Amino acid sequence: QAVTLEALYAAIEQVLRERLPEAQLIGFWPGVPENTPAVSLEIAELLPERDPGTGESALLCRLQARIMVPPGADRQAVSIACGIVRTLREQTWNLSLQPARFVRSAVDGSREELKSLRVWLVEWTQSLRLGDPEWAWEDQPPGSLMLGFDPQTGPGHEPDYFAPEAL
Amino acid sequence: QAVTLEALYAAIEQVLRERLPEAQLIGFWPGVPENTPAVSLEIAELLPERDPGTGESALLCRLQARIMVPPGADRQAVSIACGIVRTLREQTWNLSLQPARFVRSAVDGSREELKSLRVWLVEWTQSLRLGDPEWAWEDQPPGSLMLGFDPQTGPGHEPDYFAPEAL
Amino acid sequence: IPQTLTNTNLFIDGVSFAGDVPSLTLPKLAVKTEQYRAGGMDAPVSIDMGLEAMEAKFSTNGARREALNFFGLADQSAFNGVFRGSFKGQKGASVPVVATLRGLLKEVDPGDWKAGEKAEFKYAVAVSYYKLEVDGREVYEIDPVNGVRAINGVDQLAGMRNDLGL
Amino acid sequence: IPQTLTNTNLFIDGVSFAGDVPSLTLPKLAVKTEQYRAGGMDAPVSIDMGLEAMEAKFSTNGARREALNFFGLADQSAFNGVFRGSFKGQKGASVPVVATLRGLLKEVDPGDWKAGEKAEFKYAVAVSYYKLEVDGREVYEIDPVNGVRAINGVDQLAGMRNDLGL
Amino acid sequence: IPQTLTNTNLFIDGVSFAGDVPSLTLPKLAVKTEQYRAGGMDAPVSIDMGLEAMEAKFSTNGARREALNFFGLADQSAFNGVFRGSFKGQKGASVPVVATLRGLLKEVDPGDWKAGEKAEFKYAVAVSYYKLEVDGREVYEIDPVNGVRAINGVDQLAGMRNDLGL
Amino acid sequence: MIPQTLTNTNLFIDGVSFAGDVPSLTLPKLAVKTEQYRAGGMDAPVSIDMGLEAMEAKFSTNGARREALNFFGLADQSAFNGVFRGSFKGQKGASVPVVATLRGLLKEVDPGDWKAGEKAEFKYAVAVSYYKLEVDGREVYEIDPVNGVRAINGVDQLAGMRNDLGL
């Protein structure tokens, strides 16, 4: 029914392994740039949105992809980066979401270790309605309604009438 | 009656221990990340607001939650972070407050010590009417009103009339 | 204490638009006044004449077919709809406000389609029947035909229909 | 020295809205002037004709039922209300200003309900009786009917009602 | 769930403007209402009179000659055009919306030419025939002449043309 | 006195309520057939009452009110019966009714121009014989042309000149 963040992490890993065979390893929280064409997904920031009228909390998450590559293969990482951007134009990751909004793609300087020097941040935002809807007003089912009249009114004699009856 | 900051600190600790059993320790000013799934509440900034017409001072406080976790369990701290955000959509903490406004959630770099490397700042704002109302104009109770007439007027003979009288 | 709204639901004919109704505007209720200064007065007093018209403007953001199909019907007061809301103030006492209405859906407005944004259709209903219950009991009950302008239970046109025979 | 306002209270019928009345606007009092140039003059002098209408516009931010129920009453001047204010200037001498008014609550305006903000209802009263006491004593006393336009105690239409027999 | 639009295509006479049509605006459909208060009523009910006019405003950004040449033709309803769209919501179920229209291309507007920007011509068609199919089946079918105002299959003027003999 | 205006209106014809389509009424203009009279020994004529003149009471509807079209040009003149109700609410609440019983010939059905996008406005007119206006149930006007009844506020103003013509 409703979405979960673990349901979101599994489907973005799932589709990106199909479309990118040159990307050897697309993990959602890995480390250790063990080999050349690696892509490490992240989470940058999850922000509020226009709250819908139910119990779901609207959140747009700045999803983030980091394309790890040894230096000297910068062009080989833009071709990985162009593969991610062409995905994000219509992609809902098959999970009842809104299509993801692409934000930017550029080379950054990480706080982390730089043995694999060249990394390309590819970040995008997509809205989430996490959680269950919550009903608040009235919980009176169709099985409970009796409709009397003016003389058939009172705690002495009950209004002997159901709403599903004869024709 | 009116709220107190110590009444606010006790209720946010109270509810968050019920909803989050994976969060081992939610203290409002702790330190010492002694074990893995710890959450340390804070205070970031308390700011003015539109002053109501009584003696209360309107303040919105940037409340702040810091989710302390050893590195390698980043996904295990977003699941803690998603539990806090789903709380803050309607939450008044059972204290006659306005519902809290969620602001952001992202990984930060603290000024403090980083043995527990990975921390997730979750901050939110909620307005406060701290203090007592103050009356200024007139303090004349219902026990004091006498309503004479034109001939029954003067310091010689007092206006012999009460407002609660016969029918 | 102020009342922050928390929950929002819109019905059209029973179908739950709980969720994708981002904006909704109830009709502003305006007394048809008139600046009236007669002989023995200087500032003009204002006299009721009834109400003016009532437009409610919600704006769903999908190609609906469950709200689109109530445009341009041969009968007015066929689109009805029921709003449900929930203001939450004063120690979690969420007051249930409903605002059920009725009337001709007088305008369906699809916005600019710039190939990649949301839908955000816009709607406007020329409300005839309007019923606003705040916390269970009645506040505003405005039936234009039959003259049933009723405030919190009492009918303010009870003295009028006895004079007019209605 | 300027006067920063400090305290604000609004009554409707005695019920204390001290607190949640974020905005309030007293009626601007406007003389009904007329650019009058007769024969022996070039620039037009302006002549009083009385006042124009008076609208006071406060905007509470809750589903009230204690201010909503004074809309559309069968009698004007049934909603009255009493404002109380307090400007503070010149070494803590907080001058008590009250502005009690009266008239038809001519418009109740619920805003956009975008599912998560405050309420912020809007109101407008077509003021008939208006009484403004700054620091205890009278400043403006405007009764439209009976012609009782009175400035700081003296009735500026005392010479008029003797001519009209009122 | 909201519906983010994904694909946009515009035809004029079959020629694919798939691509360079950055903005497009379907006609807002407005019922010709009238605030009607008769004797036994206070608030005005609103009565249909038909629709008002329909302008669709797309804005291509090239010197076309395939859309320019339908301005000022000797016959109205010669420019027709077919829009095609695709809202995508609810687990990749992209609903195919088409909006085929017809009418006089009433205005061709070349913008400012500040020597270096894009073209961005602007257009406006006084739509006569308008047909909106959301997900295959019919929603709005508005033929002004012959009176064929049809909502989701049923003709809302079927009772009118029997009275008028059309 | 209180400010008191017209707010709402109603029309009955032979009991049938026109609660849905009457945009306008018109009570008959009661006017004295004034013959200005300057004679020997005066100036500035003195306007002797000669009697009234004809009393057309126009109104209009904009539907196919066939129950109002059936009364045009019948064999029985003064068979159109009908009241022109109307309430004046004042300022202090309770509304003062004004009703006006009519009895005359529907001498005009004037269908408006049908501009196909505007209203209809079937404008009518009744040259009434009998005419009785009430205010708050109290009598003001009895105007019966034949058999000489002009009773202003209940007292007959032609009774002194009816027991001399021998009517």
Place this chain on the structure above:
Amino acid sequence: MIPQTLTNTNLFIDGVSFAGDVPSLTLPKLAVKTEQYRAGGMDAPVSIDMGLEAMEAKFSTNGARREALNFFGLADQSAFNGVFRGSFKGQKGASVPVVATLRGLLKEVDPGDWKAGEKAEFKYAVAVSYYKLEVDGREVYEIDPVNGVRAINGVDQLAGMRNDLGL
């Protein structure tokens, strides 16, 4: 009653539909030739029906409707036949038809001023003899001048004064 107005209109002439160019119609103003009558023993005259007067039924078109120009001033007066259809939709859906069969002399073709950038508006007029209005298929008016037919709602209102003139 329901609020019911005019919405759409149609005009036929000898079967030919004017479905494309009629901006306006005008049904003939049915009016009684009222002769106000004050006699000995009364005042405020009582308006005896004398009969109707002439019934011009104007309309206008703004094209070269030559099929409407051919009927001007023929040798056979009362050879212009035509109906003035029109539907009143009401508020509750189903529309009430009003048709009006005419038979008269097209006594006026009034071509408008041709201001070269405005409409044409060939205003016409037919001094009709025969006149039959219907509402929802039910009869209200038969007005035939010659051979004495005034039948209001099906019952002949001149039949009592046609079997005495011996017509």
Place this chain on the structure above:
Amino acid sequence: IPQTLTNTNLFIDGVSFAGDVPSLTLPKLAVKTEQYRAGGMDAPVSIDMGLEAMEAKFSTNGARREALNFFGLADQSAFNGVFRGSFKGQKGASVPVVATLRGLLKEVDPGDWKAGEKAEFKYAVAVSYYKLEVDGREVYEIDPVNGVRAINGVDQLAGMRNDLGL
């Protein structure tokens, strides 16, 4: 050299509002012109007809009772007031400008009272008599009644009142 204003004083009836008068606007003086093209001309010349009306709009920021009490008086030209100003340019030569005026205080406008800001009342006087002395000597002396439109000492209506006998 430009003239930066330095000092500002406002009187009402002698009472020094030196200090809390943050904004003040003298009346713009406008000739009642008329675009007049007769026979032998193409462009329209403009002809004086006199002046139009004069509104001066100062805005004090306190609950005054010394400026409030001149609203709605039974006599116009009872509120007079004297402005005093001081432009400083050209080596400290502060030119003393005064602008004394007179007329009906036609509007008293209290702003929004959002419980914590300044007061900022607003005023507007329909100026009859207007006298502007820049550096001691006269510049503009506008008396509407008696027709005393005088520019820098000379009366521009001296030739008019001899023709009209005033």
Place this chain on the structure above:
Amino acid sequence: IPQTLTNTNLFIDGVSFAGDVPSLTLPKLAVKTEQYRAGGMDAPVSIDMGLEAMEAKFSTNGARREALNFFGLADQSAFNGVFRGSFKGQKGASVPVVATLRGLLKEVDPGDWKAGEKAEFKYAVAVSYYKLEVDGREVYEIDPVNGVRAINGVDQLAGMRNDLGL
């Protein structure tokens, strides 16, 4: 593919303003429509009546004397001018667009002269003759007098002048 404009040239009478013509606006061509609903229809169809007027507004930024001297001439259609443009799209295929026009230069507007900025004069020509060739061949040829409204070669008023004898 969109068409970014690259080159801009304006002539007035042959004199090359290639360079300093920063802004130029061709006339928007608008059909004189009319919302026409007759008897047997509900929505109004729109009918051509001809075009409305045509203003082209270029704005040179110098004291010209080669464009200033065509203001207020005794003959209209004396100022003509020829625009030349070049949209570049679809692999360097720069389409040559020219827009030659003709008419009275109806307004010369010098802007504010704040002593140090550019000139930026503004112009407006009430275009009579308008001829737009996109890529060599004709698109719009609008001669108002003689009725020569021609779209891409064919004259849309060929059937009209045979009826009118022109």
Place this chain on the structure above:
Amino acid sequence: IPQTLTNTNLFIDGVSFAGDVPSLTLPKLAVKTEQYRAGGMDAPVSIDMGLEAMEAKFSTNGARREALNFFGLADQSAFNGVFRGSFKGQKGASVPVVATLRGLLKEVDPGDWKAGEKAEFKYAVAVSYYKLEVDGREVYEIDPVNGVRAINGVDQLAGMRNDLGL
């Protein structure tokens, strides 16, 4: 090459306001056009009728007494003034533009005096005589009376005054 203005001087009656005239606006010259479509035409040609009125709006920033004293004079065309300007383009060739004018100073506008800013008075002259010489020789010479509309030396109303006898 564009023409950046460098020097600005304004005279009123010879007195050099060289310096403190921060803004100046020459009159926009507008032909009195009329959208004229007769019988044998579809688009409306525009026909001259003469010019419309001419307002020049400079705004000095001091209490002048040398420009204030030309307001409301008994004679129009008494205020004249001479502007002098200097556009500099095309290798230091500073073209001397002068714009001498004449007419009634129809409005003197002192702004808000917020006690500490500049003066910035505003002015407006209903220009009768207007003479614009760009680089020594004549461009625009507009005398409304006597009909002397002259463009770059030649009088465009020379054929008119022979017909009218002027």
